[PDB]
């Protein structure tokens, strides 16, 4: 939904989306090669689906060529200083991929606006949306945009023949927040089921070595284990086929 | 690289002249914003053609040349007794926020 | 916009010419400003800028050594230089403006600074 | 007639703190954890969601958040025995100290950390329990691990008085220092 979104958001209104109750398979998108850059910080490009986070934050917008390089931990640059400020300890992965064959259009695509100028840099992950006319000179402009006083937002106007520098590069940045129960975590494989062999099983929670055999015990719909009179594991419900 | 130009152009007072502005496709054929500058010897560098269809506010109207593909060009009609000056282009390189300037065009009128 | 840059002259490598670009007419604080210089018979050299967020940049032969400064108010505006070379021989100017956007329109009267 | 619809939880019971809300509005059990602005007579930055006398709807809640229930037909709290299956678990990590009710009668127990003795039948169904601290007979049933005890004399616990009040004694406070 966030990557295959047809309708993105601009840069002065950079997005953020908490996502919960997921199995978050990062390897299906990481191994898609539809990305100009997959830059991970704090964590590894692989070695992710073995991580269980509290929530993830999917920001989604469109920037130009060099602005992607701008997007990095603790950077200084037009977007990074006045549209979307990453911290220095950003734990997550930036996803950049070109959209010149989708978003570019003849005559220009003037729908995307970036913040021209502002007095100060943003807090890490700060959301600055105020559309107050850029004040400067010596007087509060009061809307007239007097001398030294200009508009804060500037359109892009994506022309299809523009070079990569002006091309619409769609970017999505994910951060990994850890507080609380981890409700989003990468999938876990499940090998085939083998019976009648001393195997070293690890069912979803519990481990151990045994000889798995089709039983005739009737668990209750919600029970998972079975125990012996001395509190030893004796029956396990196959969490794939009950 | 540099927006190289022939150092000299001659002409008659009253006619037009096109001051060229030449660099590779590394810059001029990648962006949409050029900036022309004209400067009397001693004056402050005064911009001429930024947003190539546009010029600064109070500049006269005989200016406003265009950009064709791999080169920009300022087309100034009516060579005045004031049109003698030096010319320097300006734009943004395709790397690390570098800004490139021009080598210099001297408008040389006959004696 | 009375930008009277002063403190320029002939200096051997090592000195730090605290150019004082008076911001008497236009602001240098909480705004965008730029320092540049032109060699004899040459275009301009983008040596420094300062943003509203106080951010700064330098070009290649001036990275690591050039450093910008200013009083907090509109008192003045500085540009500090280190390990000066003969190539740096360029009369200094101030460029009211910030980069390719916001073109440079207002300058100083011109301080003669020969770096050799 | 299903007069009881749902619950309301949370610490501050209003904004500035998340507050669970289980509700059945004749559609589905719309669970939320949005830091609501609540109403004192019912009938914003969320972190969870879900959408799907003859009734005894027993429920048990405790903390993350768990729920157990059992919906038995009945016909004044009926005696008898019925276990509670765990029908939901919720990983919401909310901090709760108070709750309310939407709108027949209901009742509010209060769990305690008490050892019991469960009698799983052959089907895995709890059929009977023994409060291991209710009365001497029960402490006996609990130490014997049995639901029946043949005649005898069994030892269960250790009566021990507790020290009612502390006391401190030191010599006559004399030999004061001549700070005067
Ligand atoms: C888990 O997923 C497997 C995937 O195959 C399910 O197994 C299928 O169950 C359906 C149910 O009628 C039948 O077609 C077959 O028994 C299985 N194979 C296929 C190809 O469908 C299984 O039912 C799922 N179980 C749970 C609890 O999700
Ligand atoms: C020093 O002399 C003063 C004289 O007032 C003493 O102060 C009081 O002394 C009487 C005598 O027993 C006490 O009952 C009061 O409680 C004292 N009051 C205060 C305010 O001190 C004082 O105790 C003498 N000794 C010292 C060490 O000050
Ligand atoms: C119950 O409430 C939820 C959320 O307010 C809503 O989505 C649903 O449509 C409601 N159902 C009815 C029957 O009102
Ligand atoms: C939740 O969102 C509200 C929306 O205004 C905001 O005021 C509040 O600070 C947020 N709380 C947290 C913990 O982010
Ligand atoms: C939860 O709330 C109680 C009081 O309502 C408080 O004592 C406790 O510290 C809180 N938990 C946390 C983690 O702050
Ligand atoms: C166990 O389950 C079966 C299932 O039909 C039921 O008939 C029986 O009464 C239950 N109890 C016992 C003790 O078998």
Author numbering:
A (entry chain E): 340 to 518, 520 to 582
B (entry chain G): 2 to 9, 11 to 27, 27A, 27B, 27C, 28 to 95, 95A, 95B, ...
C (entry chain F): 2 to 82, 82A, 82B, 82C, 83 to 100, 100A, 100B, 101 to 112
D (entry chain A): 98 to 140, 164 to 172, 186 to 196, 200 to 211, 215 to 242, 263 to 339
From the paper:
Neutralizing antibody responses to coronaviruses mainly target the receptor-binding domain (RBD) of the trimeric spike. We found another type of ACE2 receptor-blocking anti-SARS-CoV-2 antibody in our analysis of a neutralizing mAb derived from the COV107 individual. The shared binding mode of C105 and B38, both VH3-53-derived mAbs, defines a recurrent class of anti-SARS-CoV-2 mAbs.
A subset of complexes in the cryo-EM structure of the S230 mAb bound to SARS-CoV S trimer were also found with three “up” RBDs bound to three Fabs (Walls et al., 2019), although in that structure, as in the C105-S structure, the majority of complexes had their RBDs in a two “up,” one “down” configuration. The common epitope of C105 and B38 overlaps with the binding site for ACE2, rationalizing their potent neutralizing activities (Robbiani et al., 2020; Wu et al., 2020c). Mutations in the SARS-CoV-2 RBD identified by genome sequencing also include N439K, V483A, and V367F, but the affected residues are not within the epitopes of the COV21 Fab(s) or the C105 Fab, and residue 483 is disordered in unliganded S protein structures (Walls et al., 2020; Wrapp et al., 2020).
